[PDB]
Amino acid sequence: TQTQREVRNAFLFGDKKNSENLFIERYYQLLKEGGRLGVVLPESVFDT
């Protein structure tokens, strides 16, 4: 609860309780223009 409330201002989809997806937003926040991203995301990102 407290952690979710403390982080739902720095992410667009912080309200949604899918905190696993927050990492992709953090990946965008970290990568510079033209950077490369490689992840091991599960299938739920792709199909659900």
């Binding site: 409330r5 403390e6 739902r8 201002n9």
Partner: protein, 48 residues
């Protein structure tokens, strides 16, 4: 000194989380006259 005491009392006596707190926030919209772009002394917020 008074600013530091206010910060201490707000974080501890007023039971407000230190993350929800800002000290200096410049405003070039000329919100009054403190500096060339007047700023704040203490600001605390909720989850927004």
């Amino acid at each position: 000194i008074v600013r530091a005491f206010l910060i201490d009392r707000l974080v501890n006596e007023l039971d407000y989380k230190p993350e929800y707190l800002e000290t200096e926030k410049e405003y070039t919209i000329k919100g009054g006259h403190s500096k060339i772009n007047p700023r704040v002394d203490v600001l605390v917020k909720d989850d927004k």
